[model samples]
Target: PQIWQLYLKNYRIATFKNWPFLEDCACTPERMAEAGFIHCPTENEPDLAQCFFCFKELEGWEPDDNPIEEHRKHSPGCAFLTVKKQMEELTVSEFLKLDRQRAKNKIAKETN
Candidate 1:
């Protein structure tokens, strides 16, 4: 649950049964987690998925669409996606430095 909060904020996670097209969709729980989406609570509209980081609501997923690729494609500027790419390219120390800088920038903005 805490991991969910890391990606998703200010939203309730739905049960797997409530998720759209679990049987039909290629979007498995593992794939969804990798893509930073849980399930949207709207049972009536089963295709919707919310990005945990940006809170971007994405829907109308096709069966072949890979969740992670689709997420990067649609929300290229999302902080989560940006950080994911950065972590892949950088060493742990390098990433930590950048992350600390971002935190400091946030603090500076708040103080100003």
Candidate 2:
């Protein structure tokens, strides 16, 4: 089977199993970049956490910048970033709900 097939297989399995993070977010490459997540250039893996607005990968940042500092600068709600955990738990539906609510909250706060 080809690479896409593998992904499809996994997606199907995860979907049937009630995976939380299986559903794709409406995030585009541009949006993700703006939001501070580096879409994994490599295949077969997940996104590297970073500042959403700045796209600075928080994991493995060394002496220059710590996770807390990066989170503060980019994603103040880093604690709420829930894609990976949701996928691991097979809670795709809940993940989608969380994403919608969070997006709505962000928009509301920004507008206010």
Candidate 3:
């Protein structure tokens, strides 16, 4: 799934970027003792991986096509038609609402 891919990509970026200012989950993160899954906030997770917002917007993808029926078509996995709708309707900025380096150095500036 695309979300899974984003999760993979984010894991990679966290490993490679290696900025001291940022917390790279790949370098250091303690997963749950039993589940082996790391606990992350919605915002802390990768932009693409967080589909709660994007998918919600995607649900309204085909307004003229019949709002209710289109909404009914949404599912856990993205379909080709729905994916296209998401691609067309969602802007780059909207898709990546928060990206590191461009997010204005808040993490660093917070202490100062």
Candidate 4:
């Protein structure tokens, strides 16, 4: 159920594992990816945290902010945020539908 999402999580964690942030970070990247965030940085980027489940991008991270809490605040209606069960625990159809929604999200991201 969460196979591809988890795979993305792996790379997401690894991407920012060495993210070079000089100042104090409110971003808890360790738990960031666990909550569906991934790094989308460039040469002149201010270190944006991208949602692996959504096309949402969050920056201007304040101090001591809970990554998951911020995610819920910004995208309360986000599907991945409300998933009630673990990846494999979901029924076949449920997982399929969930992933299909992600596909749509991906398509829309490309359109942007």
Best by lDDT: 4
Better of 1 and 2 by lDDT: 1
What is the Cα-based TM-score of model 1?
A: 0.55
Query: Mind giving the per-residue lDDT tens digits that candidate 2 earns over 1-112?
Result: 4422211224323222211233244333332333334333223333344432233344433323333444566555553443444334646676556556556655755676
lDDT of 1: 0.59
In model 4, which range of ten residues has the least summed lDDT?
17-26
Instruction: Write the residue-wise lDDT of candidate 3 on 1-112 in tens digits.
Output: 4533332324433332222222323222211101111222333433111122123232112112332233334433322223333233656664454323223433434544
lDDT string, candidate 1, 1-112, tens digits: 4433433322333334455445446676546656767666564667677665555668877666688888988877655666655245777776556556545544654576
Give the TM-score of each candidate: 0.55, 0.31, 0.17, 0.74
lDDT (Cα, tens digit) per residue for candidate 4, span 1-112: 3446453556667757445443356555666776788887766665788787787888766556778888999978668877766554777788777878888988988998
Per-residue error at 72 for model 4, in Å? 1.7
Ranking by TM-score: 4, 1, 2, 3
Model 2 regions more than 4 Å off: 1-63, 72-79, 82-90
How far residue 38's Cα lies from its native spot in candidate 3, in Å, is 11
Which of the predicted structures, 3 or 4, would earn the higher TM-score when compared with the native? 4
What C-alpha lDDT do the candidate models reach, one value each?
0.59, 0.39, 0.29, 0.72
Name model 3 segments beyond 4 Å from true.
1-90, 100-102, 105-112
